[PDB]
Design a protein around this ligand. Sequence first.
Ligand SMILES: Nc1ncnc2c1ncn2[C@@H]1O[C@H](COP(=O)(O)OP(=O)(O)CP(=O)(O)O)[C@@H](O)[C@H]1O
Ligand SMILES: [Ca+2]
Ligand SMILES: [Ca+2]
Ligand SMILES: [Mg+2]
Length: 1011
Amino acid sequence: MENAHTKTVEEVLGHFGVNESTGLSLEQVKKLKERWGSNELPAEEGKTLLELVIEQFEDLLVRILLLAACISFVLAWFEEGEETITAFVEPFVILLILVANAIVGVWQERNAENAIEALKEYEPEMGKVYRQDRKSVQRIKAKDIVPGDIVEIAVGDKVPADIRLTSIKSTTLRVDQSILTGESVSVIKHTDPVPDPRAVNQDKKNMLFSGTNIAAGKAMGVVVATGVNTEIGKIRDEMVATEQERTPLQQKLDEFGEQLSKVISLICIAVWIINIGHFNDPVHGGSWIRGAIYYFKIAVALAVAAIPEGLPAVITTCLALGTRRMAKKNAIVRSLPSVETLGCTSVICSDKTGTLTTNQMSVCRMFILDRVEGDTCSLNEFTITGSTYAPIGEVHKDDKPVNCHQYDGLVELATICALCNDSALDYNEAKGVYEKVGEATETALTCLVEKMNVFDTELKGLSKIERANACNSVIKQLMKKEFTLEFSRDRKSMSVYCTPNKPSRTSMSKMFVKGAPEGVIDRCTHIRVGSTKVPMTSGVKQKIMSVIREWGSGSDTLRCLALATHDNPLRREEMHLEDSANFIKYETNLTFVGCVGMLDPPRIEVASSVKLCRQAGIRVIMITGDNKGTAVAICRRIGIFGQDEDVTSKAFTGREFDELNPSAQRDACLNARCFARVEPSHKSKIVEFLQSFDEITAMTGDGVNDAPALKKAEIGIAMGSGTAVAKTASEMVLADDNFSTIVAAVEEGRAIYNNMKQFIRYLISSNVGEVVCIFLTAALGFPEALIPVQLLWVNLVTDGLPATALGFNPPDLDIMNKPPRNPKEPLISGWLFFRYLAIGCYVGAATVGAAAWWFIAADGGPRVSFYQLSHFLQCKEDNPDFEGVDCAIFESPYPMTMALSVLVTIEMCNALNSLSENQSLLRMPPWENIWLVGSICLSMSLHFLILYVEPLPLIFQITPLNVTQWLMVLKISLPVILMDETLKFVARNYLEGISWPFVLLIMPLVIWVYS
Ligand SMILES: Nc1ncnc2c1ncn2[C@@H]1O[C@H](COP(=O)(O)OP(=O)(O)CP(=O)(O)O)[C@@H](O)[C@H]1O
Ligand SMILES: [Ca+2]
Ligand SMILES: [Ca+2]
Ligand SMILES: [Mg+2]
């Protein structure tokens, strides 16, 4: 079987020796599985470790340091260069910081990839098949499907294998196959053979390919290819992927990175220009060229020192951390910008059924008409025991056991619930529970028919499997279902044409209708009392709707459904089923039978999630196709409204929203928290209206009525147990259906943005101090305190791992007590630019003051004055102003070490000021981020290493400091912490000591340092 689309259905069935009615036997599957194997594709890993490394060297800020490493290599090669790496220390330390941040970026991306693919195996994909071990459809694993068995598929499902369509149960089968073909519309399928053997997948209108979704209808067919033999499996190698655009935060940070490179370019040019004067100094041999080459390395080293080279690496590190942290909460994040866009979300539109409620329906109430008087009636209300899908329950008229065979209305009520069903009941022998095959609303009616034996059937010897659809089978053997008018949401009902099998021509044919109570009763012209039908009046209709409204707004919030039948339907040839608009024309002149009410409990974690979302400024709107009274009752249960809150202008229906002027539709979206009776087309209109106010919307849903809205919101979250159509149109999947995970994704996207601002605050406020040091020294006339190899060392130990460790920062304590952030506001605030300059002005002054301290105030050094230090270039033996002072002392490596030690130490303290934007170090101690503490101890260890290991001080042109000089380094470096604690204090108390173990740890050191 290689060209199945060209063969007749009978020929494809005869090929495998399979009957469509029963299915594939057990021993046949064992033979086929031994020959064809598991219905699964080989595990594909995302990216190669090499190509994952090349991705780290893509941004502009990283390419600048690659260019500077080349310039530093060529200049080192034109000079002496007769020696090993000790003469190439400048290019070596530029590449250490590049490969260090590249390792952390690759290591964090590999961890996020492993976490996501380990979540794909959370629940195995299932598939409905017909096999000879059960007379009904059974839910089996998708990987257990063999070529040949009969597979049943309904709307919203995912095609599990290549299938040749055998019969279309509905009127029209629409399939969404954009993943394989590329066309962006539903395809109409049929069951007739196409003649072309070389037909393209577009012309194969009788085949269904794996990985595609059924957009509308119900059908079944024969599997013809599994595993790698499928169309989507044969092209798994030809998987060229479209360019996924970078996150909107990455677009803000690349624009910032490009603007920062322009400021750095002007600064390093100014450094080379303000030093035009002393190019002919005797230190350069009086050569203008060798003096210009030297101050060219000053400008290149200052470019590397000031450029945030770890910025592209820390962006992808925080994003990969957010993807890994969500996978540990069972949340498959497909689109990368989704988790950081969720931090900016302001509205969370949510489906009610299946999404805000555990989709575990069970019919617990139903009523039929007992007797009807003049313009009024009396009901026969019942209650049903059982809340699961198990067919073990009992009907109670008035808290009394009753047999439903007595009531002719209950017999007709169960006939509609059995024949107007596309779902069934399946027993899971592995889990010992009855599962649903189809939708929860229709399965609740299947379980109901089993509990009420309207036709008394002995249930003694029947197994747990045969007990699932025992009472449904005896009803389906009576009436033959001719065709089905599938359920459409513009009509909110579903019809089924049946003819009784026994040929007595008693009630030759009938249509059994079920749907929304208000819409089906509006089309019923009569009512059924027992076995007699009576013309319906307005007083009877008013009482029937009163009980439905009482059930919805009741204590248990019953989801209601009206059941009706049509006594005189048209013939099949008279009905034109070429469209769904004509379906409502046939569902007229019905006779009302009864209503069923099923309970759908809200999820336990929804009430607390709404409480935390409102605390963070996020609004939760319920967009449901269900009744308005039921939706409002769920809202009061899950906390959207209060138990006594007035919801007059906060709860709308589909038509009520349509018949509103733009003035009220403006005031609705900002105030309405519940939308009921809305079609899938209206859900997109609600979401696009909220986006018209520039609000980030996070739509959550599970069904096919949510896919148009899931594609419209900025973020689309799908439930793990929902349909595959909703999961395809979504950027996030709650694999475990945990609604609290959505509130955790919001906090993660807020933490991602916070860890960027702490990164930007650390590198700018620190590298400005490295720029101030070089300009302040040139303005005072002092000897320059840093050579190009010392600027490249302070870049390595301060811009490397200590800066990347800001991405592992803990969340703030008020991270979720703040309103959502506008994604269009500027990246850096004006108040933040002040904090960057205030810290940068101290870092530079402290570094120049450290070298001025040694020349002027230190004991081991000389005692020159401020004048002899600002005019050190004119120091000669013949100078009376310079007496007793050596001119060689101005080339001492002691003040250069004092500046290099203060610069490294003051930036390690500045990184401790970056665990939070406004929280003090007393509230959030440094051990909250153990990655930052370890990175600071590693940077201070490498600094002590180049000071005291035997050959290194000569390489970097420094000198080992003693305890007295190291105490002065700490004396000047520590006040950078007190300065940020003061700026953090003003931000808390004017712009917007808990850890006592930490106070007892630093105070003894503060006393020792300051004596
Ligand atoms: N198989 C079915 N047959 C007949 N009527 C159905 C039906 N499934 C749902 N309905 C009815 O159609 C009405 C509206 O259709 P819709 O599919 O949008 O509701 P819903 O169950 O999806 C609530 P939500 O949108 O929150 O998931 C429902 O209230 C229901 O009474
Ligand atoms: Ca740098
Ligand atoms: Ca730095
Ligand atoms: Mg839903």
